[PDB]
């Protein structure tokens, strides 16, 4: 806890120049159009543009710790809006282009964006989610559950039970939720394209899942300002703001980024909407 290995913090940011940046986003478009089963892996870098600091970025929680400095929030967890990237992943799932969403993030913004919970693995847990120790029923609350490290929150289960509610925030020592991990692994193994957005990929087994897509000839794309643990295994590496990359990507795909009505929870994915027809590529 004190002893925790927080890995490489504060590594230098890489900026692809705009012409290389444009070519790499086009190649990502082409990879998406070709792929049967696309899986997205997200980390703390997709929420920076909403006021939530990352862990190992220049002003990351762990980076600032190392330097004796505090990280800076520009929002509360309750008042944070989903970014353009968050809302773009909502859309890609609605049009059948995203098969599964693997996230390390505990900030709750994927669920609040309206992303279907049955297409999402929250590997590190969710600050707004508490779980009944007895019956395992999960509640998605409108305010952060006030504990971390799988502690009693002080509420009881109301299922048709009176189980002790606990938080879903993993401590360093805690093994990942078997269901979210099982579904994350299945999805990664069978994908022909895994796209990483704003994770350094330093945490086991979280950061290793996209590499499983590389077995049986799957392609891996890493989108990240900093070097990441698996850069050498990437077919494509894009060094740029994820919001800039995903907005350029959506325009290539001919998709609008949808409006956020405010915090909403969707347990199950809706039937797939229409999507633009595919370009001739070869």
Ligand X SMILES: Nc1ncnc2c1ncn2[C@@H]1O[C@H](COP(=O)(O)OP(=O)(O)OC[C@H]2O[C@H](O)[C@H](O)[C@@H]2O)[C@@H](O)[C@H]1O
Work out whether 256 is an interface residue with ligand 8L9 (CB under 6 A): no
Q: Which is nearer to ligand 8L9, 53 or 198 (CB)?
A: 53
Q: Helices 84-94 & 242-253, crossing angle to 10 degrees?
A: 30
- Interaction mask 77-106, ligand 8L9, x per CB under 6 A: -----------------------------x
CB of 60 to ligand 8L9, least distance (A): 8
Task: List interacting residues with ligand X (CB under 6 A).
Answer: 43-45, 48-49, 54-57, 60, 104, 124, 198-200, 202-203, 224-226, 241-242
CB of 110 to ligand 8L9, least distance (A): 12
Asked if 93 and 269 touch (Cβ cutoff 8 Å), the reply is yes
Residues 171-190 that bind Zn ion (CB under 5 A): none
Task: Report the side by side order of strands in the sheet with 164-167.
Answer: 138-140, 129-132, 164-167, 152-156
CB of 98 to ligand X, least distance (A): 18
Q: Which is nearer to ligand X, 132 or 223 (CB)?
A: 223
- Residue 159 partner contact from Zn ion, ligand X, ligand 8L9, none using kind-dependent CB cut-offs of 5 to 8 Å: Zn ion
For residue 124, indicate whether it is catalytic: yes
Query: What is the distance between the terminal CA atoms of the chain, rounded to a whole angstrom?
Result: 52
Burial environment of residue 225 by CB neighbours within 10 A (0 to 12, 13 to 18, 19 or more): buried
Q: Which is nearer to ligand 8L9, 173 or 282 (CB)?
A: 173
Work out whether 53 is an interface residue with ligand 8L9 (CB under 6 A): yes
Segment holding 81, helix H or strand E: none
Helix, strand or coil for residue 54?
A: coil
Work out whether 152 is an interface residue with Zn ion (CB under 5 A): no
- Residue 184 partner contact from Zn ion, ligand 8L9, ligand X, none using kind-dependent CB cut-offs of 5 to 8 Å: none
Provide CB contacts within 8 A for 164, sequence distance 6+. Answer: 132, 133, 134, 152, 156, 157
**DSSP summary character for residue 116:** B
Q: Which is nearer to Zn ion, 52 or 157 (CB)?
A: 157
- Residue 134 partner contact from ligand X, ligand 8L9, Zn ion, none using kind-dependent CB cut-offs of 5 to 8 Å: Zn ion
Asked if 170 and 178 touch (Cβ cutoff 8 Å), the reply is no
Does 105 count as an annotated binding residue?
Answer: no
3-state helix, strand, coil in the chain (%, to 5): 30, 15, 55
CB of 138 to Zn ion, least distance (A): 10
- Residue 242 partner contact from ligand X, Zn ion, ligand 8L9, none using kind-dependent CB cut-offs of 5 to 8 Å: ligand X
CB of 55 to ligand X, least distance (A): 3
Helix, strand or coil for residue 65?
A: helix
**CA pair distance 263, 76, nearest whole angstrom:** 14
**CA pair distance 257, 107, nearest whole angstrom:** 21
Name the binding residues: 44, 48, 55-56, 62, 104, 124, 132, 135, 157, 161, 198, 200, 224, 226, 242
Q: Which residues are annotated as a binding site for Zn(2+)?
A: 132, 135, 157, 161
As annotated, the active-site residues are 124
């Amino acid at each position: 806890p004190f002893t925790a290995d927080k890995g490489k913090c504060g590594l230098p940011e890489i900026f692809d120049p705009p012409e290389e940046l444009e070519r790499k986003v086009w190649e990502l478009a082409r990879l998406v159009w070709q792929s049967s089963s696309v899986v997205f892996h997200t980390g703390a870098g997709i929420s920076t543009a909403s006021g939530i600091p990352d862990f190992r970025g220049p002003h990351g929680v762990w980076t600032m710790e190392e330097r004796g400095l505090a990280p800076k929030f520009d929002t509360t967890f309750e008042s944070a809006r989903p970014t353009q990237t968050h809302m773009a992943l909502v859309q890609l799932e609605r049009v059948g282009l995203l098969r599964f969403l693997v996230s390390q993030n505990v900030d709750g913004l994927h669920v609040r964006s309206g992303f279907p919970r049955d297409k999402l693995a929250e590997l590190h847990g969710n600050m707004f989610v508490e779980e009944c120790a007895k019956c395992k029923t999960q509640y998605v609350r409108d305010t952060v559950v006030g504990t971390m490290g799988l502690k009693a929150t002080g509420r009881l289960c109301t299922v048709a039970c009176r189980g002790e509610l606990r938080d879903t925030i993993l401590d360093w020592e805690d093994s990942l939720p078997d269901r979210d991990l099982a579904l994350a692994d299945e999805a990664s193994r069978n994908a022909d394209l895994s796209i990483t957005l704003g994770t350094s990929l330093q945490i086991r087994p979280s950061g290793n899942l996209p590499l499983a897509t590389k077995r049986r000839g799957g392609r891996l794309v890493i989108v990240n300002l900093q070097p990441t643990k698996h850069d050498r295994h990437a077919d494509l590496r894009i060094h740029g703001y994820v919001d800039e990359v995903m907005t350029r990507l959506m325009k290539h795909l001919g998709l609008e980024i949808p409006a956020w009505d405010g915090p909403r929870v969707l347990e199950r994915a809706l039937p797939p909407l229409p999507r633009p027809p595919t370009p001739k590529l070869e």
